Amino acid sequence: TRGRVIQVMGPVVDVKFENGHLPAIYNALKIQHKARNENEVDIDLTLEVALHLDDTVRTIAMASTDGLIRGMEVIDTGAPISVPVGEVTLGRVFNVLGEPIDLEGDIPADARRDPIHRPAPKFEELATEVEILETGIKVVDLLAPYIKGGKIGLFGGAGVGKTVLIQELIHNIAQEHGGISVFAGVGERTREGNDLYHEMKDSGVISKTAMVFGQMNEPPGARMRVALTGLTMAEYFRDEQGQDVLLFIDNIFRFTQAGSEVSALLGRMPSAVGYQPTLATEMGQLQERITSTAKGSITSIQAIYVPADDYTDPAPATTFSHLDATTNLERKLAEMGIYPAVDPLASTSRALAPEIVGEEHYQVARKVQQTLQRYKELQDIIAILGMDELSDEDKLVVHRARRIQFFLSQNFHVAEQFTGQPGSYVPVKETVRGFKEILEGKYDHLPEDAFRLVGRIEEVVEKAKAMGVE
Amino acid sequence: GRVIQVMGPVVDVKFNGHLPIYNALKIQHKARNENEVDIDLTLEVALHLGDDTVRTIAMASTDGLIRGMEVIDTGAPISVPVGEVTLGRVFNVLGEPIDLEGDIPADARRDPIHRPAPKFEELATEVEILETGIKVVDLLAPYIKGGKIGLFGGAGVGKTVLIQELIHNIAQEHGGISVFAGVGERTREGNDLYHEMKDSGVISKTAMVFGQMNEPPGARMRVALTGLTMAEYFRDEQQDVLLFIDNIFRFTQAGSEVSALLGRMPSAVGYQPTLATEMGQLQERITSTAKGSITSIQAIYVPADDYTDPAPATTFSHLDATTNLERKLAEMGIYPAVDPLASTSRALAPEIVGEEHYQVARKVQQTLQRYKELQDIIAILGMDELSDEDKLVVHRARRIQFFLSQNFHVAEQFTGQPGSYVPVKETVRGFKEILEGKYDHLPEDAFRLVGRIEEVVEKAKAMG
Amino acid sequence: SDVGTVIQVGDGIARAHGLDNVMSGELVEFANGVMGMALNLEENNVGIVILGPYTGIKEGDEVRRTGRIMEVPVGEALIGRVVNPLGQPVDGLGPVETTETRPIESPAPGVMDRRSVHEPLQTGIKAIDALVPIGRGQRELIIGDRQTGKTSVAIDTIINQKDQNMISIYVAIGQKESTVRTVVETLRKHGALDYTIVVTASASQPAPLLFLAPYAGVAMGEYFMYKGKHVLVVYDDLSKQAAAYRELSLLLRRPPREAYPGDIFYLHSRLLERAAKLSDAKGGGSLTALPFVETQAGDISAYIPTNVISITDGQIFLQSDLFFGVRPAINAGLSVSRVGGAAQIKAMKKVAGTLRLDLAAYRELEAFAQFGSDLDKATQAKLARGARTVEVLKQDLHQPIPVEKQVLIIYALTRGFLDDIPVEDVRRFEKEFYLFLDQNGQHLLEHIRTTKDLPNEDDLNKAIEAFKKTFVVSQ
Amino acid sequence: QVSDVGTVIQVGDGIARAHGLDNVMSGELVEFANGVMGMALNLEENNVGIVILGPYTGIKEGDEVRRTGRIMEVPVGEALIGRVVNPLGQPVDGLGPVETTETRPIESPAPGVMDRRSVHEPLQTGIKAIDALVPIGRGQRELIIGDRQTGKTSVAIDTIINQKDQNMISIYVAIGQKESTVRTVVETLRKHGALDYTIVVTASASQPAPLLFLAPYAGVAMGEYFMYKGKHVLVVYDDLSKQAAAYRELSLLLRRPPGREAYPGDIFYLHSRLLERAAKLSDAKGGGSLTALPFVETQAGDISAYIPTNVISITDGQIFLQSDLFFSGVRPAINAGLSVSRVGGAAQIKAMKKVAGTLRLDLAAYRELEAFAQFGSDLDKATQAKLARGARTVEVLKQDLHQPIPVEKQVLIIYALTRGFLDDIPVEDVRRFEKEFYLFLDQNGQHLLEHIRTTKDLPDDLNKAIEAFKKTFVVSQ
Amino acid sequence: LLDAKASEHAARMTAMKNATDNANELIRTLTLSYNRARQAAITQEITEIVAGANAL
Ligand SMILES: Nc1ncnc2c1ncn2[C@@H]1O[C@H](COP(=O)(O)OP(=O)(O)O)[C@@H](O)[C@H]1O
């Protein structure tokens, strides 16, 4: 089971196994070559079979291909890329190859490391009744409920607290739901990545999560597989341990992007906008693997960078088709001191129907939005007629509206570090009741700043007498 | 060689060890019978196809050629007669006199039309503005001595005429060695220009190099090199030179014509994947050094009025001063139709043109832009809802955009108006007063098609 | 297994037989003496990227191996030396005597090898160091239309690096050689070549050179970085690199969106990535990248521009739509800084913060200002200083302003100290209040320096010291 | 024998070029030594492009490829009803195999010109918006085009769920759709009892392109059975935009020369030859029907996109679902403006035919008018009157989910507002009016709505006119 | 006044027609330039997709 390199095209390598052996598609092929002279370079490089082209195979190198010489033998590992799984991966940061990139040591040869390429659950294995995932985050559980076992979009990334959210999420779930999280950086900005690591070190949540980094500096192959690698680690705790896990994929766009890049070197015919003709299908076999089987479930938060704020590009288009809800982080709400900075209007959810939450959540939810729309449109007038005239109703709205969009903030567990406030996990039930009443106006006498950064509706009370009210 | 493949302008001549790149192959053949025609052609080695074969680019119609003919390697690129003999003569793409006056001496120096661009040590830095007598240019986008001027304009925008007015306003009074190479441009122009050169009194001091619309791609491919080598002579062998290249576009254009047949992968728009570099190797060569100075003005055609087209686009990063012509302004009757907010020059510095000339410069542009933005409202709501302050800006702006019109001496025969060269101090001043509001009473039409600001007052009263 | 034989020669590219031992990206050498890089290792030949004049090459010529991956001279000898991508000096100051040699393509610092950038890179241009702040080890793409002030901004920035320990590296990819001169000239006038290298691949040079220019520069930069010094690399016009690399790739007949190779993204990705802030475990070194992109019509949705943007941490977009009002055309609207605010010092942070709000409304209240007074109430108020602040963000060419006094004017208006004065007298006020800071009072003009943070005088001092010059100014 | 099998040259991306098979029919099933099935598409001189239907990893070079001699046919029968199977007919619902005697070939010619009878017999969608404004008769083809998350699926579902009393044996073809959703959907059918008449054919987004490609045709096949019997079928191809895309992939892989937007030259032929297979068989043939509901997912709602355009011109009209309407909380998100049913009106029953004629009017003007309210601060003219019942009709056109409405008590509410018997009631109370005006009828007009059933007419006009007051005159406010 | 106002509303009634009418023409002038740019675009996209296939 030994072949030799025939062609090297950039990240693409063409191995040739003389007869009969032929490493099955998706199998990982090692190349370990020690420099045999002063005119060569050490090589430790792993490949993944793509296609059989005459007892010839083509491959996509996960790492650089520089220093490769036609004829170096390639070694079929007999299996595709396989990465470690279990409590072993928790707090550990690996790379595409499931090799720890941290300084905390290395994975034993005892460790079970499953493959990165597997088919999604069988039709008879999925969840029947759609069940919501409580995040204890007011904004979410109310206006944009996460479907436990779905794919949530996270738009906007720059100074919005995006990280707290991701972090806080990892925290809440693993706290009230007892599950792991797996952060997967897929080809976007080493710089941001290094920071998130430190923040999850500080937040102490990295104890509860396994990380993988495929960053924007790796070759097509890596970027293209990282999502799978970090994925496989997540599936473990579902299938094996029955847990509801959370798989974060920062910039899943790089996945389908890196895809087309190679597709050209493989030889696939260009498709709509140069994108690999396989596009939709690649994205499917990736996404369909994320759902809630009989036993556990995996819910994913993906961050999508659209190609120049254009929502018709094949890449985003294809992704949205798997999205079950969208969480928008606006650079506006933060300024106003409303954390989380989730836009209460833009964030939508599929599970926001009375069929899936019943009326009281829905009725309340859609209401809390409407009242917010009024306070929005009126903004123009406010800046024209002052607060003097608005039909003396529009005021009542602007009253409740503020209390409401203010009460949409919260005490974040991962904010205790710089604030000291302990933090809160307000359930959907408690959350619905709070806005219910705030909507009935039974709070209209408590100063704005009372609902601002708190818990359940009671915490606004104590925050209040703390103001001095009877 | 032996030509075994003839593709249009691209000929495949087969050659052991003979393997002549950039060299000129002449095919000298005589009609053996009545089924053939005499062939006198020169091919320029392009690339080595392997198997001891070379792909060549003809300099004329390849009609009549046959597979198996005999090709001779002159053993050197296209060499062109250069020297003090080139003055008052018209050459070909190859350096052949087409003026029907004699030929060129065998002793005469023949340079190759392919040279490497001057090194970093050679090319100059120094700055000197140059007066053209054109109100727009001098004010908004002044030219520089030894600097590179582009003229961007689409079809029938006034490129040609603008050049003529430059050669008129400058070439005549410089004292310099003039080199005018019309590339891919009109055939009429050649005769219009050649026979006006005789009238005026410079057909001594100017070098005439032609190829026009009727010549195949290969031709226009090098006519811009041939003429460059001419000016390169007086610069590196002896003085300052004015290089007038008419439509450097036709160079790149003809380029794409061959790029296909070369068996090249087409680039954006179907242009040659080398478009950029091919222009890089022919630009920097047109530059002034520590040896001699080259002030060049090139006509740049804009295909379909698209400044985003690889040809003129890529050209922009090659000039120290630009004059971008707009069809709109042209139909407005504003001539030259020169974008007052697009045209630029590295000269616009207080550290170059002086403060007074600078501030007015931007002041004009400022108020022209402020008028530009207002236009959608005017086009929808008229001027009725504009402020008593924005209206004023609409008047000034207009009258300033009109005063930017000029009488070009090379016009008259049509319109009937004589012409004018407006001194720089007088342009600078003229606009001042207008921006300063001494003229806010005079109607627009008064400022249309004039010289020095005084004339506007004159043509003003003539109105009534 | 070592030697090779040319089977195609054209357009700076060649395919040759033999060389059964070459490494992907190995530097080879032709018969006539010029080099070339091998990119494709094809079964039956080799794609060689001729690194110099392709005239002196014919079919059958021997292309001999080297057994060296591309790499370039890197040393303290390069400071103020205009050298090409291969290291060869073009400035004529003689050869560059270098000892160490750094490979072109080199792995960027790992996810464990970095640190959060806290060190601001003072550009000296108010509008940028206030609004879109840049930090050390950052990547700030400045993208804009032909001649919007791109080249001039980077230059001024470099010129403002006298005080700070910054080794500037300016590359000109495809740029005009004559132009790169007046740039490297105008640099000596202000004594910037004392810290600053120059990589020029002129538009006349072969595409593969332009292509190799950027990687050639970072290498030189990564030198001081990994060593503990701070570097600044200006990639002037990455667009032309891509325009080049396309050629390179299309010559090699690489299957072609917009003719650019599928990998055309990876081209800039694996580059700008090599700029970062190395963890204090590595000597706290950094390389800041200031990439350029030439937009046609200002179309930011273009292929290349989205690519370079999806990469850099923030970008500064320069409209000309403006420098024909607010000069150093800096579109406060689109321009972002990801790192931002973690870059600015406590002096900037506290004042520069509301500077965003004030500017915000003005960009947003301005579909309103017509109504004017009719009855607009408290909103012509937020408008007032709004229309003033823009004047503040206005700066003149080649006039870098130090941080110290800078945070003082960006202070005065943000508290009302500039409002008792008309919008059309603000620019003068800067000139003014600053000299009289340089003389009248002096204590707060470098505290902001020493601590580089916080009250700059408790409150009362500054606040009342601002009463000093206001009260002494003119009409 | 020696020819009738072949050996795999190339494998990857679901495609296999094999040698041999010198006798494979273009469109013949070919089995791989590994058991995985496939299909021959490109029959070239030296090889044959196959599209692997199933896992393509268990396939390497040299593997044998042996013919079948069958053209891609599929199970058909009275036992699929209630079962969830893939495009191959292979049950995935995990309850036993599907025991069926007969079979039918996927590729089949459509009923001939003569073979059909102009559609007259309707399809009751149970959706006021649809079977009033954009009516759909049996044998018709109504393309419901719209941007993701507009309700396209919801419609099809509630439609099916509305097929219990009607005689309709329903078939829901899921192409490209998340197997997640398809399950939660096949279930909500389970609960409403749609499975008793409803067939489900799925190929999710995890399944290989060739399955997606085959799923639609595999669906019509199973339908065609009941049609050629004289029974009535309704096929919902959910998302042809994806299937049509899956073909592009597959076809591009066989390196077929790609066309505009990369789609193959026959991409149009693809859908055309598919949709036509749904019609109304002439009485001469047992007067059967197969009605087709093609979905087209739209990006940004670009109706000008290549695929969405083809299918628009193919179907008999379409139903365009606004992206914004859906969020503003208007369900269904129908756009009455662009939504049109060409076969329309022969599909509607007299009792609707009348009260529907004016419905388009009131809604028409309101669409061309209510762009102006905020400027209508001066509300003027009688243009206020057009809006009047206009904004009210919208309310009546708003329907619940999972709650179909029988024509009987439907024509009555589409009557009320169109006669003014609604107009005296503010919009706030319009929805929660029609709600008990139903019950008020299910008790006290239960006689009236009958005449509406047995005659499909209301010549009624007199009684109801007064009989409608019997309600408003007892309702709350 | 009454006759003044009667004018006002009228003059406005019209000035708000002139704008509407004119604005409507701005469509035609753009519809045209949209189609043209709709064309050159769908032509460039295709030319790109084929020219990238012939390259294989
Ligand atoms: N300065 C001018 N004054 C009057 N008419 C002009 C002027 N410039 C151009 N024209 C008119 O515009 C037309 C275009 O001339 P030309 O310079 O040949 O355009 P181009 O060379 O760009 O095709 C001419 O027919 C001429 O009559």
PDB file of N, CA and C in Angstrom, chain A residues 22 24 51-55 123-124 126-128 267-268 271-272 277-278 281 284-285 288 291 317 321-322 324, chain D residues 10-11 13 56-57 60-61 92-94 178-180 183 186-187 205-206 248-249 252 255-256 262 297 299-300 327:
ATOM      1  N   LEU A  22      -4.813   1.291  -4.321  1.00  0.00           N
ATOM      2  CA  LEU A  22      -5.771   2.384  -4.569  1.00  0.00           C
ATOM      3  C   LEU A  22      -6.558   2.878  -3.349  1.00  0.00           C
ATOM      4  N   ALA A  24      -8.983   4.344  -0.899  1.00  0.00           N
ATOM      5  CA  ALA A  24     -10.383   4.682  -1.175  1.00  0.00           C
ATOM      6  C   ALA A  24     -10.602   6.201  -1.046  1.00  0.00           C
ATOM      7  N   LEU A  51     -10.191  12.029  -6.146  1.00  0.00           N
ATOM      8  CA  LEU A  51     -10.693  11.277  -7.304  1.00  0.00           C
ATOM      9  C   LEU A  51      -9.656  10.266  -7.862  1.00  0.00           C
ATOM     10  N   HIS A  52     -10.104   9.144  -8.446  1.00  0.00           N
ATOM     11  CA  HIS A  52      -9.177   8.248  -9.176  1.00  0.00           C
ATOM     12  C   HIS A  52      -9.153   8.624 -10.643  1.00  0.00           C
ATOM     13  N   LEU A  53      -8.022   9.140 -11.107  1.00  0.00           N
ATOM     14  CA  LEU A  53      -7.969   9.716 -12.436  1.00  0.00           C
ATOM     15  C   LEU A  53      -7.717   8.660 -13.492  1.00  0.00           C
ATOM     16  N   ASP A  54      -6.043   4.938 -14.679  1.00  0.00           N
ATOM     17  CA  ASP A  54      -4.649   4.538 -14.858  1.00  0.00           C
ATOM     18  C   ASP A  54      -3.943   4.396 -13.507  1.00  0.00           C
ATOM     19  N   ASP A  55      -4.677   3.878 -12.523  1.00  0.00           N
ATOM     20  CA  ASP A  55      -4.128   3.624 -11.195  1.00  0.00           C
ATOM     21  C   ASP A  55      -3.459   4.887 -10.664  1.00  0.00           C
ATOM     22  N   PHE A 123     -33.376   8.895   7.977  1.00  0.00           N
ATOM     23  CA  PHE A 123     -34.670   9.552   8.112  1.00  0.00           C
ATOM     24  C   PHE A 123     -35.374   9.094   9.374  1.00  0.00           C
ATOM     25  N   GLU A 124     -35.152   7.840   9.772  1.00  0.00           N
ATOM     26  CA  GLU A 124     -35.801   7.260  10.949  1.00  0.00           C
ATOM     27  C   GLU A 124     -35.077   7.620  12.257  1.00  0.00           C
ATOM     28  N   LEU A 126     -34.108  10.969  13.061  1.00  0.00           N
ATOM     29  CA  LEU A 126     -34.203  12.378  13.435  1.00  0.00           C
ATOM     30  C   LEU A 126     -35.293  12.612  14.449  1.00  0.00           C
ATOM     31  N   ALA A 127     -35.417  13.871  14.876  1.00  0.00           N
ATOM     32  CA  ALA A 127     -36.386  14.241  15.898  1.00  0.00           C
ATOM     33  C   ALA A 127     -37.683  14.419  15.184  1.00  0.00           C
ATOM     34  N   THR A 128     -38.765  14.055  15.854  1.00  0.00           N
ATOM     35  CA  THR A 128     -40.084  14.168  15.259  1.00  0.00           C
ATOM     36  C   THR A 128     -40.679  15.573  15.534  1.00  0.00           C
ATOM     37  N   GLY A 267     -10.292  20.248 -11.509  1.00  0.00           N
ATOM     38  CA  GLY A 267     -10.785  20.160 -12.881  1.00  0.00           C
ATOM     39  C   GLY A 267     -12.293  20.207 -13.113  1.00  0.00           C
ATOM     40  N   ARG A 268     -13.046  20.451 -12.052  1.00  0.00           N
ATOM     41  CA  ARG A 268     -14.474  20.674 -12.172  1.00  0.00           C
ATOM     42  C   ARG A 268     -14.788  21.949 -12.982  1.00  0.00           C
ATOM     43  N   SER A 271     -19.112  27.073 -12.361  1.00  0.00           N
ATOM     44  CA  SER A 271     -20.556  27.141 -12.151  1.00  0.00           C
ATOM     45  C   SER A 271     -20.992  28.618 -12.003  1.00  0.00           C
ATOM     46  N   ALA A 272     -22.198  28.863 -11.492  1.00  0.00           N
ATOM     47  CA  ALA A 272     -22.647  30.242 -11.289  1.00  0.00           C
ATOM     48  C   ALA A 272     -21.647  30.996 -10.428  1.00  0.00           C
ATOM     49  N   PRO A 277     -19.323  23.525  -9.025  1.00  0.00           N
ATOM     50  CA  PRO A 277     -20.626  22.978  -9.434  1.00  0.00           C
ATOM     51  C   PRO A 277     -21.174  22.027  -8.384  1.00  0.00           C
ATOM     52  N   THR A 278     -20.316  21.603  -7.465  1.00  0.00           N
ATOM     53  CA  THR A 278     -20.707  20.667  -6.425  1.00  0.00           C
ATOM     54  C   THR A 278     -21.278  21.415  -5.228  1.00  0.00           C
ATOM     55  N   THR A 281     -24.310  20.627  -2.913  1.00  0.00           N
ATOM     56  CA  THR A 281     -24.145  19.304  -2.333  1.00  0.00           C
ATOM     57  C   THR A 281     -23.089  19.230  -1.206  1.00  0.00           C
ATOM     58  N   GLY A 284     -24.582  20.671   1.843  1.00  0.00           N
ATOM     59  CA  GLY A 284     -25.614  19.804   2.379  1.00  0.00           C
ATOM     60  C   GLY A 284     -25.057  18.725   3.281  1.00  0.00           C
ATOM     61  N   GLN A 285     -24.131  17.942   2.739  1.00  0.00           N
ATOM     62  CA  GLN A 285     -23.540  16.832   3.483  1.00  0.00           C
ATOM     63  C   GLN A 285     -22.807  17.362   4.713  1.00  0.00           C
ATOM     64  N   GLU A 288     -26.391  18.711   6.996  1.00  0.00           N
ATOM     65  CA  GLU A 288     -27.357  17.694   7.354  1.00  0.00           C
ATOM     66  C   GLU A 288     -26.839  16.874   8.521  1.00  0.00           C
ATOM     67  N   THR A 291     -28.088  18.018  13.516  1.00  0.00           N
ATOM     68  CA  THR A 291     -29.527  17.927  13.856  1.00  0.00           C
ATOM     69  C   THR A 291     -29.707  17.158  15.147  1.00  0.00           C
ATOM     70  N   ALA A 317     -26.515  32.271  -0.323  1.00  0.00           N
ATOM     71  CA  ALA A 317     -27.807  31.734  -0.709  1.00  0.00           C
ATOM     72  C   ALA A 317     -27.892  30.327  -0.161  1.00  0.00           C
ATOM     73  N   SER A 321     -30.463  28.499   3.090  1.00  0.00           N
ATOM     74  CA  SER A 321     -31.351  27.389   2.891  1.00  0.00           C
ATOM     75  C   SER A 321     -31.262  26.374   4.018  1.00  0.00           C
ATOM     76  N   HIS A 322     -30.162  26.360   4.775  1.00  0.00           N
ATOM     77  CA  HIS A 322     -30.119  25.553   6.010  1.00  0.00           C
ATOM     78  C   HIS A 322     -30.408  26.288   7.315  1.00  0.00           C
ATOM     79  N   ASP A 324     -32.196  28.093  10.332  1.00  0.00           N
ATOM     80  CA  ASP A 324     -33.499  28.126  11.017  1.00  0.00           C
ATOM     81  C   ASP A 324     -33.823  29.384  11.821  1.00  0.00           C
TER      82      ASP A 324
ATOM     83  N   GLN D  10     -12.870   6.109 -14.107  1.00  0.00           N
ATOM     84  CA  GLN D  10     -12.715   7.225 -13.179  1.00  0.00           C
ATOM     85  C   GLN D  10     -13.838   7.334 -12.156  1.00  0.00           C
ATOM     86  N   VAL D  11     -13.473   7.679 -10.935  1.00  0.00           N
ATOM     87  CA  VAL D  11     -14.447   7.847  -9.884  1.00  0.00           C
ATOM     88  C   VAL D  11     -14.155   9.193  -9.250  1.00  0.00           C
ATOM     89  N   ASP D  13     -16.901  12.611  -7.261  1.00  0.00           N
ATOM     90  CA  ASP D  13     -18.049  13.499  -7.366  1.00  0.00           C
ATOM     91  C   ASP D  13     -19.331  12.811  -7.894  1.00  0.00           C
ATOM     92  N   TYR D  56     -20.583   7.009  -3.400  1.00  0.00           N
ATOM     93  CA  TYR D  56     -19.622   6.830  -4.465  1.00  0.00           C
ATOM     94  C   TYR D  56     -18.197   6.539  -3.942  1.00  0.00           C
ATOM     95  N   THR D  57     -18.027   6.467  -2.617  1.00  0.00           N
ATOM     96  CA  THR D  57     -16.696   6.233  -2.027  1.00  0.00           C
ATOM     97  C   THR D  57     -16.316   4.765  -2.096  1.00  0.00           C
ATOM     98  N   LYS D  60     -14.041   2.190  -6.495  1.00  0.00           N
ATOM     99  CA  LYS D  60     -12.736   2.533  -7.038  1.00  0.00           C
ATOM    100  C   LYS D  60     -12.615   2.105  -8.517  1.00  0.00           C
ATOM    101  N   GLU D  61     -11.438   2.316  -9.099  1.00  0.00           N
ATOM    102  CA  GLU D  61     -11.192   1.859 -10.458  1.00  0.00           C
ATOM    103  C   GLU D  61     -11.362   0.357 -10.549  1.00  0.00           C
ATOM    104  N   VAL D  92     -37.679   4.838   3.459  1.00  0.00           N
ATOM    105  CA  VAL D  92     -36.831   5.383   4.523  1.00  0.00           C
ATOM    106  C   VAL D  92     -37.549   5.679   5.843  1.00  0.00           C
ATOM    107  N   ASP D  93     -38.871   5.534   5.862  1.00  0.00           N
ATOM    108  CA  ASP D  93     -39.650   5.837   7.070  1.00  0.00           C
ATOM    109  C   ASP D  93     -39.438   4.817   8.185  1.00  0.00           C
ATOM    110  N   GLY D  94     -38.728   3.741   7.847  1.00  0.00           N
ATOM    111  CA  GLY D  94     -38.398   2.687   8.788  1.00  0.00           C
ATOM    112  C   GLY D  94     -39.594   1.919   9.320  1.00  0.00           C
ATOM    113  N   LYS D 178     -34.126  20.016   3.588  1.00  0.00           N
ATOM    114  CA  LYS D 178     -33.539  19.372   4.761  1.00  0.00           C
ATOM    115  C   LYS D 178     -34.374  18.161   5.197  1.00  0.00           C
ATOM    116  N   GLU D 179     -33.736  16.992   5.297  1.00  0.00           N
ATOM    117  CA  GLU D 179     -34.398  15.774   5.763  1.00  0.00           C
ATOM    118  C   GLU D 179     -34.982  16.033   7.143  1.00  0.00           C
ATOM    119  N   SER D 180     -34.436  17.032   7.839  1.00  0.00           N
ATOM    120  CA  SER D 180     -34.944  17.460   9.142  1.00  0.00           C
ATOM    121  C   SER D 180     -36.378  17.859   8.975  1.00  0.00           C
ATOM    122  N   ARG D 183     -39.060  15.506   7.679  1.00  0.00           N
ATOM    123  CA  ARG D 183     -39.573  14.666   8.730  1.00  0.00           C
ATOM    124  C   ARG D 183     -40.640  15.417   9.534  1.00  0.00           C
ATOM    125  N   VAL D 186     -43.592  15.520   7.366  1.00  0.00           N
ATOM    126  CA  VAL D 186     -44.292  14.270   7.105  1.00  0.00           C
ATOM    127  C   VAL D 186     -45.099  13.881   8.338  1.00  0.00           C
ATOM    128  N   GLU D 187     -44.737  14.463   9.476  1.00  0.00           N
ATOM    129  CA  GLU D 187     -45.372  14.133  10.741  1.00  0.00           C
ATOM    130  C   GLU D 187     -46.604  14.969  10.940  1.00  0.00           C
ATOM    131  N   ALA D 205     -30.822  17.326   1.408  1.00  0.00           N
ATOM    132  CA  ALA D 205     -29.644  18.034   0.902  1.00  0.00           C
ATOM    133  C   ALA D 205     -28.304  17.304   1.163  1.00  0.00           C
ATOM    134  N   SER D 206     -28.370  16.233   1.952  1.00  0.00           N
ATOM    135  CA  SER D 206     -27.253  15.305   2.156  1.00  0.00           C
ATOM    136  C   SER D 206     -27.086  14.253   1.034  1.00  0.00           C
ATOM    137  N   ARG D 248     -27.625  20.448 -12.864  1.00  0.00           N
ATOM    138  CA  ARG D 248     -26.501  21.229 -13.362  1.00  0.00           C
ATOM    139  C   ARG D 248     -25.202  20.589 -12.877  1.00  0.00           C
ATOM    140  N   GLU D 249     -25.111  20.356 -11.569  1.00  0.00           N
ATOM    141  CA  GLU D 249     -23.932  19.710 -11.008  1.00  0.00           C
ATOM    142  C   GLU D 249     -23.648  18.442 -11.819  1.00  0.00           C
ATOM    143  N   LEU D 252     -22.636  19.006 -15.319  1.00  0.00           N
ATOM    144  CA  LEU D 252     -21.322  19.620 -15.415  1.00  0.00           C
ATOM    145  C   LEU D 252     -20.209  18.607 -15.160  1.00  0.00           C
ATOM    146  N   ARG D 255     -18.954  16.717 -17.719  1.00  0.00           N
ATOM    147  CA  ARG D 255     -18.334  17.734 -18.552  1.00  0.00           C
ATOM    148  C   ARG D 255     -19.188  17.934 -19.787  1.00  0.00           C
ATOM    149  N   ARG D 256     -20.449  18.290 -19.576  1.00  0.00           N
ATOM    150  CA  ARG D 256     -21.379  18.570 -20.681  1.00  0.00           C
ATOM    151  C   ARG D 256     -21.254  20.061 -20.941  1.00  0.00           C
ATOM    152  N   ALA D 262     -24.512  28.439 -16.373  1.00  0.00           N
ATOM    153  CA  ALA D 262     -23.909  27.114 -16.171  1.00  0.00           C
ATOM    154  C   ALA D 262     -24.887  25.966 -16.415  1.00  0.00           C
ATOM    155  N   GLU D 297     -37.708  28.541  -5.483  1.00  0.00           N
ATOM    156  CA  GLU D 297     -37.151  29.375  -4.423  1.00  0.00           C
ATOM    157  C   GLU D 297     -36.431  30.515  -5.118  1.00  0.00           C
ATOM    158  N   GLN D 299     -34.185  34.187  -4.994  1.00  0.00           N
ATOM    159  CA  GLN D 299     -33.223  34.978  -4.274  1.00  0.00           C
ATOM    160  C   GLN D 299     -33.558  36.440  -4.486  1.00  0.00           C
ATOM    161  N   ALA D 300     -33.804  37.131  -3.382  1.00  0.00           N
ATOM    162  CA  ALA D 300     -34.093  38.544  -3.458  1.00  0.00           C
ATOM    163  C   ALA D 300     -35.428  38.725  -4.150  1.00  0.00           C
ATOM    164  N   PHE D 327     -43.268  38.765   6.829  1.00  0.00           N
ATOM    165  CA  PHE D 327     -42.757  39.239   8.115  1.00  0.00           C
ATOM    166  C   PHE D 327     -43.757  40.165   8.768  1.00  0.00           C
TER     167      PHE D 327
END
